[PDB]
Amino acid sequence: GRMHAPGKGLSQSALPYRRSVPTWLKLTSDDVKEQIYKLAKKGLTPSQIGVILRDSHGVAQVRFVTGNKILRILKSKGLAPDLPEDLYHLIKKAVAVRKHLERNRKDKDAKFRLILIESRIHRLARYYKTKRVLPPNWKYESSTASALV
Amino acid sequence: IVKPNGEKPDEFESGISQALLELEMNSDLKAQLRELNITAAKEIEVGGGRKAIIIFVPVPQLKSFQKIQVRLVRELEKKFSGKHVVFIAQRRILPKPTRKSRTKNKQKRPRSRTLTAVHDAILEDLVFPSEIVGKRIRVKLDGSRLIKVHLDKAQQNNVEHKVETFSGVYKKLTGKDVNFEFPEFQ
Amino acid sequence: VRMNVLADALKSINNAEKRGKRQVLIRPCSKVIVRFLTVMMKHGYIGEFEIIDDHRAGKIVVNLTGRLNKCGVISPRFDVQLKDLEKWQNNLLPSRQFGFIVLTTSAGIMDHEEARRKHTGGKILGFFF
Amino acid sequence: PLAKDLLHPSPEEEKRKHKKKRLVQSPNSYFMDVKCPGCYKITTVFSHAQTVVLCVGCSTVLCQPTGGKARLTEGCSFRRKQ
Amino acid sequence: ADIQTERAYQKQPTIFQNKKRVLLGETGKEKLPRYYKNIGLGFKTPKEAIEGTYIDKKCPFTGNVSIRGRILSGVVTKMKMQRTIVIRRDYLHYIRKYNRFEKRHKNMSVHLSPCFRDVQIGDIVTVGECRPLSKTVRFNVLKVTKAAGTK
RNA sequence: UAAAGUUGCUGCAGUUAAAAAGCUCGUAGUUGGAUCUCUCUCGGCCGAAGCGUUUACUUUGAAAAAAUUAGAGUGUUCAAAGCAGGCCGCCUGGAUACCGCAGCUAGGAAUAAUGGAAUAGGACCGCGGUUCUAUUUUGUUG
């Protein structure tokens, strides 16, 4: 079930058994790498890059063509973002909720949802600090987190 | 050219190298075989009277070998008539680390160096033109495991006659009995 | 969330055998599940089983021959010495004539009689009879 | 009922199941080569695309995102791969 | 650095540092021998102990303490005294009625010689038992293994 | 104390008999998915070292007062006991087991935790560069 909801949804991707490059796909691994570089330079997160490559260029899975994952490729080329995109989007959502709550002080539902969002933020940040992805002194403070956005 | 990793060439290895040099000098694919190389080769009985030629190839070249493996295997089968030919990448298995291993490991053994991964890759490469589409390990009452491999329907009758030498080669270099079959539902 | 995949597998086998079914599906598969199943099968309690290999975590289709009364797991995996084995047998097994306690020992996964033969102890995985 | 058995065919009972609940999971989607009548080259489009993709040589809306499978424009001939 | 930060003179008591100097006795260098000893049990004398200048009479390598008895291990949890740290030993205690365990810990104030610089919180220390050094200290840090995460 | 599975670790209950917090979040605690199979002086490949990756577990070996308990021998007239006694000077016992946890030790390596190589200040390999270096001067050292 969801971490912060009573939902028990099942909807997710189902990878095919075959791990090979599709026969239709004629892009070399380096071609996919350069397309990834271009999309990252455009200002896109790895999830967006994967979605675009799947929808338009027919790249069913970048890991199966290049032997590497999109975030690893971005890091190896040196153009990966400062903090992971899931944590970034969680902080962005928290910032939006706080901005809404500043001008709507009677919204208890917004306060409850903000509590849930910040709990998720803290859990993800602790995990990232454990993996040395974030500096050990990193902390999410709700005073200037809009700069992190 | 044959360059064994332990620099120990053999007479059969020499004959296979001579045949490959022959394809190197004049063939429709002479541009590729000049820069390519094989680590070893050997023959084995597979049951009855048929024979199989396992051509051991360095890993970095395997993909390139797989670019032209169909024509190469066709011509080498023609040169040897009734002995089937299979290209397998030369892969080493780093032993599972123990508490008593004197001096065999200084860095983490990669998962690609493990016995399970190496045997899976051997099974994948042994059947190259036909892609594996499923595996079933049936455990018999005596405890022995029989692997059933489902092969793609795009290339079935081109390698249907190969289902016999494939099991023989896998028994020879892996020790596991395996059956190869083709499913009706893709 | 699910811990103890072996508990799930054993409960599934038990529930299927109590309904009189001929096969049971087990997911996910694991090495411990396969060894426990092999121990069960060597004593004629289940029969042949097939390991379906998907690229994430396999499944097992276990053929059931209705000779199984109860296959169960013991959580936590208590450490069992050769002295405590008799007390565990009295607690778990329905008779001294049949039934097996499965242990994981440094010599592998084996029933309690085989652990007495090799003069070894270990951790209790479960039981079947 | 006697799973994974060839004696009783079940292509129809397997592609009816949920994709995750199958014996071996497999996607319900596909990639398709699309020709635009005004265009002259292939475009490989995902069936459940989430992007408004355009022709690689023009500015024509090939498909639009929907709740599930993407909706293709008229006249564009689409054929599944594999 | 000045090793004379005390009201009394700090020196190694077994080293004579004012043997007479003459023209032949000084040729551009004063020289100062360093007393150090090899403690037993396979522990190797750290380089900074041999080539250092600190004065520590409780140091196992250059001081006046004999390592005999228990050789234990711990995790550094506090470094806030002078030449002393607090390590934490974590163990499991077996309750027999329930056939189960419970987490327990004990803090240990152990002497850390100036020969171990760059010791962090979370580092593992092998300490050896010696004579009472203070009210609570009975163990001396013999070896330091850095926590996983060195890069 | 057992009966008391009416304190439930084994092993109890919690819709209505006594009982689930009004509801979420949340640190500690507890619990956590799959996955990795021939190296130091030798006069027996023929004495040895680990300098290498840690523990839990399990098995073993040391060490561990007696008395008590268990238990071997022994007709106290029997028995509780005792450590006696037996044979025609002699013969014989005064055993043995257990002794939990922690500590010590040595095999096993399933299970469970844990570790390395990801800006390579990574493994092996030979090269460029430094030292009184317990002798690289039976000759008084230089």
What Rg do the C-alpha atoms of chain C give, in angstroms? 14
Question: Which residues are bridge partners to D34 per DSSP?
Answer: D43, D78
Spanning CA of A129 to C1' of F30, the rounded length in angstroms is 23
CATH label of the domain that carries residue D9: 2.20.25.100
d(CA D75, CA A124): 48
The distance (Å) linking the CA of A99 with the C1' of F47 is 81
Q: Which residues pair with C72 in a beta bridge?
A: C127
Between CA E9 and CA E18 the distance in angstroms is: 14
Q: Is C59 on the interface with D (CB under 8 A)?
A: yes
Strands B132-139 and B83-90: unpaired
Cα angle D63, D66, D67; round to 5 = 155
> Cα–Cα distance between A83 and A101 in angstroms, integer?
25
Entry field: residues in chain A: 149
Phi and psi (nearest 5°) for C25?
Answer: -95, 135
CA atoms of B51 and B59, how far apart (whole Å): 24
* Euclidean distance between CA atoms B55 and B72, whole angstroms: 11
Task: Determine the Cα–Cα distance for residues B146 and A9; give it in Å rounded to an integer.
Answer: 38
| Category of A78 on φ-ψ map: left (φ > 0), alpha (ψ -120 to 50) or beta | left
Distance CA A108, CA C96 (A): 65
Rounded Cα–Cα distance for residues E84 and E127 (Å): 12
Nearest C-alpha neighbor of A57 from the set B185, D46, E144, E92: D46
SS3 category, B15? helix
State the SS3 of chain E: CCCCCCCCCCCCCCCCCCCCCCCCCCCCCCCCCCCCCCCCCCCCCCHHHHHCCCCCCCCCCCCCCCCCCCEEEEEEEECCCCCEEEEEEEEEEEECCCCEEEEEEEEEEEECCCCCCCCCCCCEEEEEECCCCCCCCCEEEEEEECCCCCC
The letter for the amino acid at C108 is G
Annotated binding site of D for Zn(2+): 36, 39, 55, 58
Q: Do B133 and A17 touch (CB under 8 A)?
A: yes
Q: Which amino acid is at D24?
A: V
Q: Which position has the token pair 């397998």?
A: B88
- Domain architecture of chain C: domains with CATH: 1-68 (3.30.1370.30), 69-129 (3.30.1490.10)
Note every long-range contact of A4-7, with CB atoms under 8 Å and residues 24 or more positions apart, other chains counting. A4/A116, A4/A119, A4/A120
Tell me how crowded residue A105 is: count the other CB atoms within 10 A of its CB: 9
The B51-58 sheet, strands edge to edge: B40-45, B51-58, B83-90
CATH of domain E1-151: 2.40.50.1000
- The Cα-based distances of C94 to B81, C101, E110 in angstroms read 65, 11, 56
B97 nearest nucleotide via C1' and CA? F53
What contacts B27, CB < 8 A, 6 or more positions away? Answer: B33, B75
Spatial strand order of the sheet with D43-46 comes to D43-46, D31-35, D77-80
CA distance C23 to D3: 7
Distance CA B154, CA A23 (A): 11
Cis peptide leading into residue C76 (ω within 30°): yes
d(CA B21, CA B38): 11
Q: In 3D, which of B33, B34, B39 has the Cα closest to residue B75?
A: B33
If phi > 0 it is left, if psi is from -120 to 50 it is alpha, else beta; for residue A117 that is: alpha
Look up the CATH number of domain A81-149. 1.10.287.10
Residues 124-143 of E with CB under 7 A from strand F: none
What CA–CA distance (Å, rounded) separates A36 from A30?
A: 10
Residues composing chain C: 129
Chain breaks in chain D (C to N over 2.5 A) after: none
How are beta strands C122-128 and C100-105 bridged, if at all?
antiparallel
Is the CB of residue A41 less than 8 Å from the CB of residue A79? Answer: yes
Give the closest residue to C53 by CA, choosing from B150, D34, A34. Answer: B150
Q: What is the DSSP string of chain D?
A: --TT-SSS--HHHHSSS-TTTSSS---S--EEEEE-TT--S-EEEETT--S--B-TTS--B-EE--SSSPEEPTT-EEEE--
Q: Is C5 exposed, middle or buried (0-12, 13-18, 19+ CB in 10 A)?
A: middle
Q: List the structure tokens of E146.
A: 């850095």
What's the sign of the alpha-carbon dihedral D46, D49, D51, D53? positive
Whether chain A has a CB inside 8 Å of the CB on C55: the answer is yes
CA nearest D72: which of A62, A58, A11, A55? A55
User: What are the residues whose beta carbons fall under 8 Å from the beta carbon of C16, sequence distance 6 or more?
Assistant: C23, C24, C64
The dihedral through the CA atoms of D52, D55, D59, D60 has a sign that is: negative
Report the distance separating Cα B14 and Cα B22, nearest Å: 12
Alpha-carbon distance C59 to C72, whole Å?
Answer: 19
Query: Which residues in chain B have Cβ-Cβ distances shorter than 8 Å to C106?
Result: none
Residue among C119, C96, C122, C94 at smallest CA distance from C108: C122
Question: Closest partner residue to D4 among C22, C54, C61, by Cβ?
Answer: C61
**Nearest-neighbour CA in chain D from B125: distance (Å):** 21
DSSP secondary structure letters along chain C: ----HHHHHHHHHHHHHHTT-SEEEESS--HHHHHHHHHHHHTTSS--EEEEE-SSS-EEEEEP-S--S-EEE-SS--EE-TTHHHHHHHHH-S-SSS-EEEEEETTEEEEHHHHHHTT--EEEEEEE-
Residues paired with residue C100 on neighbouring β-strands, in sequence order: C128
- Residue A3: exposure state from Cβ atoms within 10 A (0-12, 13-18, ≥19): exposed
Q: E44: Cβ–Cβ under 8 A, 6 or more apart, which residues?
A: E38
Instruction: Answer yes or no: are the C-beta atoms of E89 and E108 closer than 8 Å.
Output: yes
Q: Which of B176, B168, B163 is nearest to B51 (CA)?
A: B168
Number of domains into which chain D is organized: 1
- Residues of C within 8 A of A19 (CB-CB) are 55
Are C and B neighbours with ≥3 CB pairs closer than 8 A?
yes
Elucidation method:
cryo-EM
State how far the Cα of B105 lies from the Cα of B169, in Å rounded to an integer: 30
Contact, E93 CB vs strand F, < 7 Å? yes
Resolution of the experimentally solved model in angstroms: 2.7
User: Which CA distances in Å does C99 have to A144, C39, C43?
Assistant: 66, 12, 10
Contact criterion met (CB < 8 Å) for B184 and D24: no
Residue among B154, A58, B105 nearest D33 (CA): A58
Of C48, C52, C53, the CB nearest to B139: C48
CB of A14 within 7 Å of some strand F atom: no
Q: Residues C93, C49: contact at Cβ < 8 Å? A: no
* Omega cis (within 30) before C28: yes
Question: After which residues are there C–N gaps above 2.5 Å in chain A?
Answer: none
DSSP classification of residue A22: P
Whether residue E141 contacts residue E76, with contact meaning beta carbons closer than 8 Å, is answered with: no
Contact C68, C13 (CB under 8 A): yes
- Sorted by where each begins, the domain ranges of chain A are 26-80, 81-149
Closest CA to E110 of E47, E60, E35, E52: E60
Contact call for C54 and D25, based on CB within 8 A: yes
Domain holding D27, by residue range, is: 1-82
Alpha helices in B46-164 (DSSP H): 59-67, 69-80, 115-126
Q: In terms of DSSP bridges, do strands E100-111 and E84-95 run parallel, antiparallel, or are they unpaired? A: antiparallel
- Taking the C-alpha atoms of residue C36 and residue C27, their distance in angstroms, rounded to an integer, is 15
Say if CB C44 and CB C111 are below 8 A apart.
no
Using the structure block, give the residue that is written with the tokens 């092998």. Answer: E126
CA distance D18 to D27: 10
D19 touches chain A (CB under 8 A): yes
Taking the Cβ of residue C51 and every Cβ of chain D, the question of whether any pair is shorter than 8 Å is answered with no
Judged on CB neighbours under 10 Å (0-12, 13-18, 19+), E87 is: buried
Q: Is there a contact between B170 and B178 (Cβ–Cβ < 8 Å)? A: yes
B181: its two tokens:
């079959």
Q: Cα(E149)–Cα(C117) distance, rounded to whole angstroms?
A: 45
Q: CB-CB: which of B134, B136, B185 is closest to D14?
A: B185
Residue type, B20: L
C-alpha angle A69-A42-A61 in degrees, rounded to nearest 5: 25
Instruction: Give the number of other Cβ atoms within 10 Å of residue E86's Cβ.
Output: 16
Measured in whole angstroms, the distance separating CA A103 from the mean position of its chain's CA atoms is 29
Task: Answer left, alpha or beta for residue B122, where phi above 0 means left and psi between -120 and 50 means alpha.
Answer: alpha
Instruction: Say what angle helices A108-130 and A85-103 make with each other, to 10 degrees.
Output: 160
Contact B81, B51 (CB under 8 A): no
Asked if residues D47 and D29 have their Cβ atoms less than 8 Å apart, the reply is yes
Q: Are E140 and E127 in contact (CB under 8 A)?
A: yes
